[PDB]
Amino acid sequence: EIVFGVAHIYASFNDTFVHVTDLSGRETIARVTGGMKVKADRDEASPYAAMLAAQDVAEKCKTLGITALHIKLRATGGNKTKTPGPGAQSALRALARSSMKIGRIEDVTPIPSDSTRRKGGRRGRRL
RNA sequence: UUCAUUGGUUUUCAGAUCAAGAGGUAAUGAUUAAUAGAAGCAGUUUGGGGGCAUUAGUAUUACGACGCGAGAGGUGAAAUUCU
Structure with a gap:
């Protein structure tokens, strides 16, 4: 009756993804x-x-x-x-x-424990 | 110094100094513990203080595979760059 895939919406600066896939994540449905x-x-x-x-x-x-x-x-x-x-x-x-009658609204954005050195360099992106 | 003069014999004196008594009545003799300092301590601790061992955490790159499609990255806008 009901069937549950996921959405994996990746919405950044400059681009957005909608990547619906399996309950695993592997076999995708409408990658676009x-x-x-x-x-x-x-x-x-x-x-x-x-x-x-x-x-x-x-x-x-x-x-x-x-x-x-x-x-x-x-x-x-x-x-x-x-x-x-x-x-x-x-x-x-x-x-x-x-x-698409949905419920689970989660946010897997990565969140590190003070990892390495983003670019720009110490004064960076002077505008 | 007196033994007129002068010493062998030795005492007073012992001008003396150094032992010396148990002639040791002795208040017998050692200031306070700085709101100075160092030191100690069932102490009770507290702290991203220090050194070495031990390990953890997501993330990043890379690589593998599996699936899906052709666009992905980046900018004020591009392009170099990846496919």
Whole structure:
């Protein structure tokens, strides 16, 4: 009846991913992103494109019979940003308002115990 | 010094100094413990203090495999760069 894949929405600066896959994570369903939806090479990050990604996946997993999903945000925080970018809320609105009745809203962004030396160098990114 | 003068014999004197008594009545003799300091201590401890051993944590790169698709990275915008 109900069936549960996951979503793995990876919403950063400059890009957004919607990567629906198995309960394991391996066998993917509708890998597509928002960066393959707007033809400008700067427009990849827009909330239009995160919908325009999620306007495609949320039907395609229905063509694979997926009724329900879990959500896993990502930021892209390594040493880096550690907050989801502009099109994170643009996907979950686009995904949930396409008849995918979901509950689990988690955030697997990485969070290290003071790891190595992000770039820029001690004064960096002077603007 | 007196033995007129002068010494062998030795005492007073012992000008003396050094032993010397148990002639040792002796208040017999050692200041306080700095809100100085060092030191000690069932002490009770406390601290990312120091050294060496022991290990842990996610993350990062890399590499493997499995799946999925072609775009991914980056910028104010690109491109070099990866596929």
